[PDB]
Structure formats: structure tokens, C-alpha cells
Scaffold this active site. Structure first.
Site, PDB file in Angstrom:
ATOM      1  N   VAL A   1       1.391   1.813  -3.555  1.00 28.41           N
ATOM      2  CA  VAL A   1       0.114   2.302  -4.081  1.00 28.41           C
ATOM      3  C   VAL A   1       0.011   3.814  -3.898  1.00 28.41           C
ATOM      4  O   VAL A   1      -0.310   4.558  -4.831  1.00 28.41           O
ATOM      5  CB  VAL A   1      -1.068   1.581  -3.413  1.00 28.41           C
ATOM      6  CG1 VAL A   1      -2.372   2.102  -3.994  1.00 28.41           C
ATOM      7  CG2 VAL A   1      -0.942   0.079  -3.603  1.00 28.41           C
ATOM      8  N   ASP A   2       0.280   4.288  -2.681  1.00 23.79           N
ATOM      9  CA  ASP A   2       0.132   5.713  -2.380  1.00 23.79           C
ATOM     10  C   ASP A   2       1.322   6.569  -2.807  1.00 23.79           C
ATOM     11  O   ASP A   2       1.305   7.772  -2.528  1.00 23.79           O
ATOM     12  CB  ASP A   2      -0.130   5.915  -0.888  1.00 23.79           C
ATOM     13  CG  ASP A   2      -1.488   5.405  -0.462  1.00 23.79           C
ATOM     14  OD1 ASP A   2      -2.343   5.160  -1.341  1.00 23.79           O
ATOM     15  OD2 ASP A   2      -1.703   5.272   0.760  1.00 23.79           O
ATOM     16  N   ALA A   3       2.353   5.985  -3.425  1.00 20.07           N
ATOM     17  CA  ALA A   3       3.518   6.766  -3.854  1.00 20.07           C
ATOM     18  C   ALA A   3       3.134   7.967  -4.725  1.00 20.07           C
ATOM     19  O   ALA A   3       3.353   9.122  -4.343  1.00 20.07           O
ATOM     20  CB  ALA A   3       4.499   5.857  -4.599  1.00 20.07           C
TER      21      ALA A   3
ATOM     22  N   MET B   1       0.817  -1.206   0.000  1.00 19.85           N
ATOM     23  CA  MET B   1       0.000   0.000   0.000  1.00 19.85           C
ATOM     24  C   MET B   1       0.855   1.261   0.000  1.00 19.85           C
ATOM     25  O   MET B   1       0.416   2.307  -0.502  1.00 19.85           O
ATOM     26  CB  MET B   1      -0.970  -0.069   1.188  1.00 19.85           C
ATOM     27  CG  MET B   1      -1.921   1.094   1.369  1.00 19.85           C
ATOM     28  SD  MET B   1      -1.169   2.503   2.212  1.00 19.85           S
ATOM     29  CE  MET B   1      -0.794   1.750   3.797  1.00 19.85           C
TER      30      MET B   1
END
Lengths: 134, 77, 52, 266, 77, 77, 77, 77, 76, 77, 77, 77, 77, 50
Positions: free
Chosen positions: K58-60, K55
Site C-alpha cells: 500500500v505504502d510503496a 500495508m
């Protein structure tokens, strides 16, 4: 590692600890690992690769059966199984001759439902007889 | 002046949509090919053959799109 | 636009619609009613057969 | 006769109204602006269909025998069984209201929708020429006001049952504490559950209206724009489709009333 | 006059969207062709026949779109 | 300008969205046709007749758009 | 000034749509690779070679799009 | 003149979006129909009955959208 | 003037569509990672190695889009 | 001129997006209904009673969207 | 002036696309996480550990998008 | 006073995107509900409880979008 | 003046895309939760614990879009 | 649309139809139908082997 038990209504085919195994399934072949996800399934005509300690394989014919993986110790149940050197290439070639005759000698659907199983038996033997050479 | 300038945007939309179409279509088809190869490894030389049969049909149209994108960008410009 | 023809066209549409309704909508209804009278007739018979 | 297509469509889309302050049947070319301009069509057709429903069911109720049922009586006991079976599926409390409420909702909304299948010009033409009324439309549920009237009635019953069973403490607990539980989230929860609560009746009313108004508009458009030879061949398929629509919309209004009152009480 | 740039833009939209449709539809269909053929290694020619039958329908509307896009760019513009 | 070019743009939108819809709907439907054809290869005639029953409904509503787009280009513009 | 301010949007469309296309295509294909490598990790290198074969097909067109976006943005400016 | 000429664009948007919605919805629904029709032959007519029933609900909104688009073209523009 | 806000709009489009791409592609990839990991625990390190190998390829293009978004935004 | 034009444009966008929403949502939901009908056919009269419940919620919001669309067209003009 | 009117729009589109991307990505990834528990719960903590590990990537990108949206809205203004 | 005409557009986009989100979310949620009903039909009144609990969260944001769009359309406009 | 038109449109785009993202994310995640609840009842509370854990992260980024849309609507415009 | 008195008129009709159904129609219809069902149920209960 883990312990594998292979049995049929006629004899115990194998019993002991093993490093890894590759086994036939209903949809396709599957490789098991130590502590693998527990599962059970029926198996299509094929074979099992028994790679034991120090990396030594042996090849067991599994014409039909069920495989069990719920515990760490796994289990194969065989409706028909043959040890890899009781069978031979000549026997699988006889199966090839039989099946290639019955394909020409089956003309309806029920008799093809039987000739297809005869062919599957022949093909699984023709497979294991080649794997046996390793 | 806009008769030069808008043609780059008009090629931009063509070669954006051609890329999305080709990429997603081949992604879906090739993913089905990979799962089939994972379960039937003996049949890989056959499944690969069928894969390359189908893939040219996937690419039939996006290469019309990309060829006309190149034409619009450089020939008419 | 001529208006008399539109009401005439609605009449034709209604006729053709009626011929659809008679042959796909009404018979299911008559079937349902007839089978519910079958059911309760059977029920009242199978009630009076206790008397035997 | 200077009938443009747009004007024919417009006249079919013009309600017949009466101002209760002058108490006169006003003209549709110029619409007055006040709350008291009752739509004559909506009221008359809705009440007449409701009375017809009650008359048929009463015409069996005042005569019913527990012997062999007749071919008409069987039709009414089919729908009684259908309604009671659907209520028995989704409601297990003792209330005497839910079952007759579901029955009336089903049959009344069905008849009101049934009005839409009749030819678009028949009753309006008779109303203008024979009587003299300056406008007419004949589908009651194709007007917002009646559908919101039914939805708000169901709303008030939802409040009645929630209060009645839960008591003062329970209803306030459900409105504040859910869905995020902790008392830190109460200020948001009043908005979320309040809007959900208010959404239930709004959904009922606008579902039914959105279906029926657009259906009648499709008939109006076919009659107004396209030539006769195409009017029949496009009118028949839409009627065959709209039979399914009318049945399912009545059924959905009934089913969601049962569901909402069940979730209010239980 | 400037009008001729919008015609390239219109053909761009039409043909790029047809490329999206004709790529992804055949991608999905061919993925199922391969997946079905993988489990049972027989009956592929009758099964392959069916792939061409349905693929003929998938790309028909995109073929109309691509033809009109070419007409707009080269014939009209 | 504003009369003709916007009519071609409207046609582009109509016959491009019709392409997306009519292509992907038939891709989705035909994939299930081929999966059924691989599981039950004696049923393929019956399954393909069911497929044409469904496919007629899939294509109809895009075909309105395609025909009316041709109308907008040639009849109107 | 007036000319250049739209060529960066012509670049933006190409690279936005090519990024979506390449990213999601490789996502689908690689998800199938990891699935197949979960069933038979014994074949993880063989499936890895098939992955690198098919991925070069997947991102061919998106790279034409990204290359011409970089050309437009840094050579036409 | 722009007022009516844009109304053609508004109808294009409305009925194209309706086309994609209806086509893909019916595609998914019919795909599940065919899968069931391959599993259970006597269910082919039963599932086809339910298929028609809920296809009415799928098309209820797109049909009014398309009708209103045609109304915009022929009675507003 | 009119130039610079349109530059910010173009940067917004590039760096938004890159967000969609890099989000969904790795959602699709990492879901298969988690199922494979939930089935072969000792192979979680092995599968995670393969996960980063393919993650580089997934991130390849969205980072071009992000670098050009920052260039259009700040460096011109 | 262009005040009344843009109102119908707004109604177009509203009802088009509503059409996509209703169509696709019921397509997915009815596909699952058909799969459940195919596996247990004698259980259809219960699952259909659950389908109408869920379908009411699915359409509830697109239908207030549709209501305001026809309000914008016919009431605001 | 016009600058702020367009800059709030730019920040809005950037943060909206970021929201869609991040939310759906974690939706899929956490969907597989929650699936694993339904199979059996004893690696809920360890699958939740790999869940955070993934995750993060994912949030990068969406937080680069959010950071620049916040910068545009509060610092370029 | 041109101000009015954009506000209907701004309400239209809110209610359209809200309709799409709140229709497809409940479609995906309810399809899994129906397959759960098809497996375990004696549990249906339990899964209906969980389904309402989750559906409230699906409709958290979209009912705010509809609330404020319905506000903008009437109160502000 | 010119300010409020575009500022409402910016807030509308922001919250509409947020309304897509949150709804689809919770739809997928909740659908997996419900098949988990149907598959393993009496683990409903533990799976619901994990469901809220993931739901907090899935909706985290969209909440900011909602907050800044409310800010743009009721503070800046 | 046009907020109008018709909504309250339809509310009067709706509530009075529900009350008429509760009072006149529903109790006798259900009474007769279920009394037939009761007679058949006892017809099951009645059934010389005993």
C-alpha cells in the site's frame, strides 16, 4: 483431517473421517476444508461430495436439511436424504416425468409453491444421478 | 500554433475520461459476474452470455469518446 | 419592473397555498386533538369505573 | 416607479437600524459603521413572538384543570408532552432548568421561523407606507445576531454544567488528557478539545442562520426577478418545502441543546 | 483567429463526462441484473425486460451530451 | 473570443455534471429496483411504480441544468 | 521553448486518468476473484481463467490511452 | 466583456456541483427505499413518507445553491 | 524560466494520480484478501500467491506513470 | 472590474463544494436510516430521533461554509 | 521569482494526492482487519501480520510521491 | 492591491474541501452507528458514547482547516 | 508581491486534500469499529486498541501534509 | 456579518423568557397535567374481586 457426521430422522447416512467435502447451501454451493471457519446454514435441494482417504468420493442426495461447521468435526442434518445407489437414473427420470407433468398441471400460486418444490426435488436428483457416474 | 497544440490536450481529456468510465463500469459489472460464477458454477455458460450482452451497452459511449479522441489527435491534429 | 403585479402574484400564491394547507396540514392537527380528547375521555371513564 | 430587479432584492435585503448615539432611525441607502446600530426588526419580532408564546402557555397555566381537557388545552399539553418526552429520553439528572429551557427553545425558534412563510411584501410595505420606516424584514432567525445570542447562552450553560458536576479536577482532566490519553500529547489535546467545545455553539448558531436567511432570500428572488404568473407557481412549492424546514430546524436546535447539556453534565 | 481550439476542448469535456456517466451507470445496473438472475435461474425474460426499461433512462442525459458534443465538433467548429 | 467560447464552456460544465449526476443516481436506484425484482418477481409492477415516483425526483434537478445549458448555448450564445 | 512545454501536460492527463481507470477497475474485478476463490478454492483455476478473460476487456481502452500518451511524449515531443 | 461572461462560468460551476450532489444523494436514499418496499408491502407507504421527509433535508442545500446560481445569471451577470 | 516549473507540475499530476490508482486498487484488492484469509487459514499462503499474481496487474500502469513522472522530472 | 467578479467566483466554489458535502452525506446517512426503518418499522420513532442527532453533526460544517458563501456575496460584495 | 512560487505548488499537489491515496488505502485494508477481530479475536496477531505484509505494498508508491515532494520543496526549491 | 482577491479563493478551497471531508466522514460513521442501533436498540447510549469518541477524531483535521481558512478570510485578508 | 498569492494557494490545496484523506479514512475505519462494537460489546476495549493502532497508520501520511502546509503558510509565506 | 448590540439585546430577551418559564409557566403546567395522570394511575390502583 476431520470427521463428518450425516444423519436423517430415518437413518445415519455416514460417519467418519474425510479429506474434503463440497456441500449445497441456501444461496449457493460451498466447499469445506480442515479447520474451516465455523458456520451453520440451511441447504437447498442438492447433494454432498464425500471425498474420503486416498481420494475416493461418494455421492449422497440431500433433498433438504441443515449443515453445521462449528467444531472441527462437522455435521449434516437431513430432512430427506438418499444414498447414491439406492436412487438411480430411472428414479430421477421418473421424477422428471412427474415434475414436467405438474408444471403443466399447476395453475395458481400455492399449487405452484408445491410444484416448484417437486421440481426442485426432481432436479436435485437429476443432478446427483449424473455426479454418481464419477 | 495553438490550433495544433491544444488539440492534443483536448484529445487527452477525452481518452482519459473514456478510460476511467469504461474501466470502472466493466470492473463493477465483471465483479458481479465473478461472484455469481463463484456461487453458481453450473450457470457460468449462461451468466457469461448475459455478461457479454450487457458489456456492449457499457462500451457504447466510451468508444464514441475514444474514436473521436483518435480522430482529433490524427485527422485534425 | 412593474411592482403591483408581483404583490398580486403573491396573493394568488397565498390562495393556492391556503388550499393546500386546508387539505393536507390542518386535518392532521384536528385529528391529533380529537384523538387526545378521545384518549383522556376514555381515561376518565376508565377511572370512574373503579366506583362500580 | 424605477424598480430594477436587483434593487428590489436589495431593499428586501436591507435591515432597519438605529444608532444609539444619535438615537435616530437611520436610512438604508448609506449604512453607518458602529456596533450600536441596533437592528429594529430583529429585536421587535423576536421579543413579540416570545411574549406570545408565554401568553398562550400562561393562558392555560393560570386556568388548567385536571378534569377533561379542552380542545385548546390539549394542543399545549401535546407540545409539553413532546418536549418532556424528548428531554426524558436524553437527560436523567435532576435539573429543573433543562426541561423549560428546551420548551422555550422549541416554541420560540418555531415561531421565529414561522415568520418566513408570510408574503415577502406585506409587513415591509405596511411599515414603509403606513408608518414610514425606511426599511423592514420580518424573520428574526434570518439574522445572525439573534441566533448567536441563543448559541452563546447555550455555551454558557454548557460551561456551567460541566464545571458544576465535574469540579475543578474533572474538567481540566477531560480538556487535557483526551483523546490521546498520554501526557506527551497534552499540548495538542488542548487545541482539539478546545476547538470541539467551541464548535458546539458555533454549529448551533450557524445551522439555524444558514437555513433561514437563504430561505427568505429564495422568496425575495422569486418576487424580484420572475414574472407574476411564474411567481405563484414557484412560490407554492418552496413554501410547502419550507414548512418542513422550519419545523425540523426548531426541533434540531432543541435536540442538540439537550444533547450538549446532557454531555456537559453527565 | 485562434477561437476554434476551445470548441474542441468544450466538446472534449462534454463527451468525456457523458462517457463516464453512461459507462458507470450501466455498469452498476447490469451488475445488479446479473446478481439477481444468478440466485434464481428463472423469470429472466420479464426480469430482462426491466433491465432495458431502466437502462433507457440511465443513458438519456449522456445521449444528449454526446449529440451536442458531435454538433460542436463537426457542425460548429 | 472571450464572449462566445466561455459560454460554450459553461454549457459544457453544466450539461456534463448533469450527465454524471443524472446517470449515476439512476444507476444506483435501478440496481435496487432489479434486486427487488429478482427477490419478489410478483411485485415488479408495484416496485416499478415506486421506481418512477423516486426517479422523477432524481432527474428533476439535473433537468434544470440540462435545459439551462441548452438556453446558454442557443439563447445566450 | 514555447511549443513543447504543453505536450507533456497533454501526456500527463492521459496517463494519470488511464492509471486511475485501469488500477481501480482491476482492483474491483480482482477483489471479486479473491472472494470467489475464498468460497470455492476448488475452482481457483477456473475462476482464474475467467479473471484473465475479463481483465483483457477491462484494460483495453486504458492501454490505448497509455500508448498514445507515450506516442505524444516521445514521438511528438 | 469578461466580467459578466465569467459570471456565467461561476454559475455553471455552482449549479453543476449542486446537481451532482442532489442527484446522487437522492439516488442512494431512494435505492434503500425500494429495497425496503420490496421486503414489506405495507411499509411501501410508510417508508415512502419517511423518504419524502428526509429528501427535504437532502435538497435543502442544493436548492439554495441552484437558486443562487440562477441569481448570478439573471441578477449579477 | 517558465518551462521547467510547468514540467514539475506535469510530473506532479502524473505521479499523484498514479498514487491514487495504486493505493485504492490495492486497498480494494487486499481487503478481499484479508476476509478470505480470515476464513481459510491454511489457504492463506495459496490466496497470498493469487494476491501477488493480481497485484502485478494492478501495479502495471501506475509504474508506467511513475517512470514517466521521474523522466519528465529529472531526465528532461 | 475583476475584483468583484472573483468574489462571486469564490462564493461559487465554496457553496458548490458545500452542496456536494451536505447532499451526499445525508444521502448515505438517510439510506441507512431507511434500511433500519424497513427491518423494524415499529421502531422508526426512535431511529428518527437518532437520525436528527447525527444529521445535525453532518450539516454543521457545510453550513458554516454556506454562511461564509452568502457573506462573501452579500456582505463583501 | 516565479520558479519557487510554482515549485511549492507542485510539491503541494504531489503530497496531497499521496496523502489521500495512502490514507484511504490503509483505511480500507485496516477496516477489513478490524472486521476480522469482530468476527473473532484469536487471529488478531496473524491478521495483523498479513496486515503489515500488505500495508507495505500500500505504502510503496505514495512514499515515492512523498520523497519527490520533499525533494522538490527542499532541494529544487 | 490585488493581494486581497486570491486570499478569499484560498480560504474558499480550504473550507470547501474541509466541508466535503467532514460531511462524508460523519456520514459513513453515522450510518454504521444507525445499523448498530437497528440491531441492538437497548445498547444505543453505549454506541452514542463510542460514536462521539470516534467523531472527534474524524473532525480533528477538518476543524483545523476551517479554523485557518476562517483566519485567512478575516485576519490576513 | 507575486509570492504570497500562490504560496497560500499551495498550502490551501495541500491541507484541503489532507482534510479529505484523513476524514474519509477514519470514517471508514471507525464505521467498521462501531459495527464491531455493536456486534461484540465487552470487546470494546480490545477493538479500540486495534482501532488506535490502525488509526495511527491511516493518518500517518496526511499528518506530513498538514505539517508542511503549516510550514508553507507560517514560514515560507 | 455586522457585529451589533442586537446580540446582547436578544440575550436579555432569551434569559428573561427562560426565567419566566421556570417561575410562572412550567411548574403549574406540569403540576396540573401530572395531577390528572396521578388520578388516572390511582384509577388503575382502585380497581370487587379483591
Amino acid at each position: 483431517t476431520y470427521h463428518l457426521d450425516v444423519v436423517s430422522a430415518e437413518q445415519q447416512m455416514f460417519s467418519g473421517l474425510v479429506e474434503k467435502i463440497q456441500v449445497t447451501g441456501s444461496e449457493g454451493e460451498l466447499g469445506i476444508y480442515p479447520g474451516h471457519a465455523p458456520l451453520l446454514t440451511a441447504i437447498k435441494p442438492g447433494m454432498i461430495r464425500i471425498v474420503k482417504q486416498h481420494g475416493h468420493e461418494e455421492f449422497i442426495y440431500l433433498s433438504g436439511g441443515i449443515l453445521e461447521v462449528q467444531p472441527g468435526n462437522v455435521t449434516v442434518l437431513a430432512d430427506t436424504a438418499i444414498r447414491g445407489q439406492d436412487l438411480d437414473e430411472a428414479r430421477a427420470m421418473e421424477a422428471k416425468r412427474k415434475a414436467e407433468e405438474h408444471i403443466s398441471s399447476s395453475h395458481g400460486d400455492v399449487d405452484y409453491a408445491q410444484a416448484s418444490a417437486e421440481l426442485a426435488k426432481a432436479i436435485a436428483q437429476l443432478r446427483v444421478i449424473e455426479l454418481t457416474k464419477k | 500554433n495553438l490550433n495544433m497544440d491544444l488539440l492534443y490536450m483536448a484529445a487527452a481529456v477525452m481518452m482519459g475520461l473514456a478510460a476511467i468510465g469504461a474501466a470502472i463500469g466493466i470492473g463493477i459489472l465483471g465483479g458481479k459476474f465473478l461472484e455469481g460464477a463463484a456461487r453458481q458454477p453450473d450457470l457460468i455458460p449462461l451468466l457469461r452470455t448475459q455478461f457479454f450482452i450487457v458489456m456492449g451497452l457499457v462500451d457504447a459511449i466510451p468508444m464514441i469518446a475514444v474514436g473521436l479522441g483518435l480522430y482529433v489527435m490524427f485527422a485534425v491534429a | 419592473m412593474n411592482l403591483n403585479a408581483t404583490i398580486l402574484g403573491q396573493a394568488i400564491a397565498f390562495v393556492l397555498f391556503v388550499l393546500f394547507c386546508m387539505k393536507y396540514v390542518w386535518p392532521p392537527l384536528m385529528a391529533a386533538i380529537e384523538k387526545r380528547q378521545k384518549e383522556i375521555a376514555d381515561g376518565l371513564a376508565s377511572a370512574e369505573r373503579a366506583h362500580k | 416607479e424605477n424598480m430594477t430587479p436587483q434593487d428590489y432584492i436589495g431593499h428586501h435585503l436591507n435591515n432597519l437600524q438605529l444608532d444609539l448615539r444619535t438615537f435616530s432611525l437611520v436610512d438604508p441607502q448609506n449604512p453607518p459603521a458602529t456596533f450600536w446600530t441596533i437592528n429594529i426588526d430583529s429585536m421587535f419580532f423576536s421579543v413579540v413572538l416570545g411574549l406570545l408564546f408565554l401568553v398562550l402557555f400562561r393562558s392555560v397555566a393560570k386556568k388548567a384543570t385536571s378534569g377533561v381537557p379542552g380542545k385548546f388545552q390539549t394542543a399545549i399539553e401535546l407540545v409539553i408532552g413532546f418536549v418532556n418526552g424528548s428531554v426524558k429520553d436524553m437527560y436523567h439528572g435532576k435539573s429543573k432548568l433543562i426541561a423549560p429551557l428546551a420548551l422555550t427553545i422549541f416554541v420560540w425558534v418555531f415561531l421565529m421561523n414561522l415568520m418566513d412563510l408570510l408574503p415577502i411584501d406585506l409587513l415591509p410595505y405596511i411599515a414603509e407606507h403606513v408608518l414610514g420606516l425606511p426599511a423592514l424584514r420580518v424573520v428574526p432567525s434570518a439574522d445572525v445576531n439573534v441566533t448567536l445570542s441563543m448559541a452563546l447562552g447555550v455555551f454558557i450553560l454548557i460551561l456551567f454544567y460541566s464545571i458544576k458536576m465535574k469540579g475543578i479536577g474533572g474538567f481540566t482532566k477531560e480538556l487535557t488528557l483526551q483523546p490521546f490519553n498520554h501526557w506527551a500529547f497534552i499540548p495538542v489535546n488542548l487545541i482539539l478539545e478546545g476547538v470541539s467545545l467551541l464548535s458546539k455553539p458555533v454549529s448551533l448558531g450557524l445551522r439555524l442562520f444558514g437555513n433561514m436567511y437563504a430561505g427568505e432570500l429564495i422568496f425575495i428572488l422569486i418576487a424580484g426577478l420572475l414574472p407574476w404568473w411564474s411567481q405563484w407557481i414557484l412560490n407554492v412549492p418552496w413554501a410547502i418545502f419550507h414548512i418542513l424546514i422550519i419545523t425540523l430546524q426548531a426541533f434540531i436546535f432543541m435536540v442538540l441543546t439537550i444533547v450538549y447539556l446532557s454531555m456537559a453534565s453527565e
